[PDB]
Amino acid sequence: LRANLLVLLTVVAVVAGVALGLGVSGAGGALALGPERLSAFVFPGELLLRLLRMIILPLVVCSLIGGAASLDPGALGRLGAWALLFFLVTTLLASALGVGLALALQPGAASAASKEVLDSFLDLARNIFPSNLVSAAFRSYSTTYEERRVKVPVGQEVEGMNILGLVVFAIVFGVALRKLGPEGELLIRFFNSFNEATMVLVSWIMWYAPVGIMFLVAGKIVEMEDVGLLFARLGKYILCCLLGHAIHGLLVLPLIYFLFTRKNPYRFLWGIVTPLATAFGTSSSSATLPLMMKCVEENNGVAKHISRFILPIGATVNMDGAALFQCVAAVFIAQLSQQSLDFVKIITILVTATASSVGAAGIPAGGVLTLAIILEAVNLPVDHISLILAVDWLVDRSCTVLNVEGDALGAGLLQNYVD
Ligand code: NA
């Protein structure tokens, strides 16, 4: 049966990728391979990432326009308000859990070894309302400084898709098309057709997902080295992050889903195994978004409009795992510096992590850079980020899995709420 066949292929691909990476590293690794052969070996994962990122723009734009244009403005507003409330509550719970685990386990007991806040939030506001749509299709506004010796911000458009601005524009355009009446109907049809066509492409790219995922992990454990030393250095911190992610994903979110929707939450999770493993392989929520929409619509009973309206918004707003990681890292650095944490400091770490989780730049370091602003919100040293960079390759993937899982569970919860 194909639904189980794809899951079996994905699991086999992940296991074989880990085994192949360990074998290649044990046979000589990158030194035996060389940089040319290393890039050639990694290439299929890069190809999968390119295929996933190619169809992000038409999928998101058409899906959001169709979803907004298919609901009454009051109903759409209420649905969006409920979705935002769910996202905020889940992010707060994730941050609180991360802080609690970091304080309980004390990963900083071993002691064996940028952009401003206001500019970051102004950049977020600028990215919400893009200056140019075609430019927003592949560029985002970022603030840089010039020493005019007082530094002043300048800002320019740097590479990287502006998903948030496209999402906002698509929602507003769908609302306008709904308001038009008959005149807009044709356009709605057009966009709907376009979206369906993109879905067909996904149904093919999905079948290449396992073969890529294997390589996408194998090279990732071949490029790295000194696994034992890094684990001996940061075992407590890695355990804190991974345990927080596991508790939030396997206990808290399914508990909320069961409380609000009496159905089995793990049966729901079984239907999105492939997008979750794709998120782990790629470490990007936007790239695994199309597969998650496909699985949520097909494997689960979520309605088309609800899924295509909630999942694109959550893919940019809901970042539970990132908030958990940032809170854990901030607390860990606080214990490293022998500096006690105040209750006000806990409140502000929670609030800052939740606020800065929204609208991630999307680059692999985007979370890490975020922590810097966080560590500039409350006075803590920012050099220690170096050791955090030693293992970010795995923590980021663990974060991405949780980011997309929260989206899927929220879509299911809202679908039940409408029912
Ligand atoms: Na997300």
Task: Give me ligand 1 centre to Cα 402, in Å.
Answer: 8
Classify 350 as helix, strand or coil.
helix
Q: What is the resolution of this structure in A?
A: 2.9
What six digits make up the tokens of 85?
């409330």
β-strand pairing of 156-159 with 152-153: unpaired
Rg (CA), the chain: 22
318 is known to lie in a ligand binding site: yes
C-alpha span between 394 and 400 (Å, rounded): 10
Q: Measuring CA to CA, which residue among 228, 225, 230, 237 is closest to residue 110?
A: 237
> Per this entry, what is the length of the chain?
419
Task: Give me ligand 1 centre to Cα 400, in Å.
Answer: 8
> Cα separations (Å) of 305 from 289, 301, 308, 311?
15, 12, 5, 10
Under a CB-based contact definition with an 8 Å cutoff, are residues 324 and 402 in contact? Answer: yes
What six digits make up the tokens of 218?
């194998």
What six digits make up the tokens of 298?
């097909």
Q: How many CB atoms lie within 10 A of CB 262?
A: 8
403 is known to lie in a ligand binding site: yes
Q: What is the residue whose two structure tokens read 């029912």? A: 419
Task: Give me ligand 1 centre to Cα 403, in Å.
Answer: 4
CA atoms within 13 A on the CB side of 338: 3
C-alpha span between 130 and 139 (Å, rounded): 10
Contacts (Cβ under 8 Å, ≥6 apart) of 177: 65, 68, 69, 184, 187, 188
Angle among Cα 352, 122, 314 to the nearest 5 degrees reads 60
**What superfamily in CATH does domain 2-418 come from?**
Sodium:dicarboxylate symporter (1.10.3860.10)
Q: Measuring CA to CA, which residue among 406, 58, 46 is closest to residue 199?
A: 58
Contacts (Cβ under 8 Å, ≥6 apart) of 388: 237, 329, 368, 371
CA atoms within 13 A on the CB side of 255: 8
Classify 226 as helix, strand or coil.
coil
DSSP 8-state symbol, 383: T
DSSP 8-state symbol, 251: I
**CA atoms 160, 161, 163, 169: torsion sign:** positive
The DSSP element (H or E) to which 218 belongs, if any, is helix 182-223
The one-letter amino acid code at 399 reads C
Q: How many CB atoms lie within 10 A of CB 125?
A: 11
Neighbours of ion ligand 1 (CB under 5 A): 285, 314-315, 318, 403, 407
DSSP 8-state symbol, 250: I
Task: Give me ligand 1 centre to Cα 276, in Å.
Answer: 12
**What method was applied to determine this entry?**
cryo-EM
316 is known to lie in a ligand binding site: yes
Task: Give me ligand 1 centre to Cα 338, in Å.
Answer: 34
**CA atoms 382, 384, 386, 387: torsion sign:** negative
Based on DSSP, count helices (H) and strands (E) in the chain, helices before strands. Answer: 19, 4
Classify 112 as helix, strand or coil.
coil
Q: How many CB atoms lie within 10 A of CB 374?
A: 23
C-alpha span between 91 and 98 (Å, rounded): 11
Under a CB-based contact definition with an 8 Å cutoff, are residues 242 and 362 in contact? Answer: no
C-alpha span between 403 and 218 (Å, rounded): 23
Q: Measuring CA to CA, which residue among 303, 317, 249, 209 is closest to residue 98?
A: 249
Task: State how far Cα 398 lies from the chain centre.
Answer: 10
Q: Measuring CA to CA, which residue among 371, 350, 386, 341 is closest to residue 104?
A: 341
Angle among Cα 287, 289, 291 to the nearest 5 degrees reads 100
Contacts (Cβ under 8 Å, ≥6 apart) of 52: 205, 278, 282, 287, 288, 290, 291
Classify 300 as helix, strand or coil.
coil
What six digits make up the tokens of 375?
């560590």
C-alpha span between 322 and 357 (Å, rounded): 6
Task: Give me ligand 1 centre to Cα 318, in Å.
Answer: 4
- CA end-to-end span of the chain, whole Å? 29
> Cα separations (Å) of 68 from 162, 201, 236, 308, 356?
19, 23, 46, 9, 26
Three-state secondary structure readout of 124-179? HHHHHCCCCHHHHCCEEEECCEECCCCCEECCEEEECCCHHHHHHHHHHHHHHHHH
Q: Domain boundaries in the chain?
A: 2-418
Q: Measuring CA to CA, which residue among 288, 151, 118, 103 is closest to residue 212?
A: 288
Task: Give me ligand 1 centre to Cα 406, in Å.
Answer: 7
> Cα separations (Å) of 94 from 6, 107, 244, 353, 395?
30, 18, 8, 10, 15
Q: How many CB atoms lie within 10 A of CB 199?
A: 20
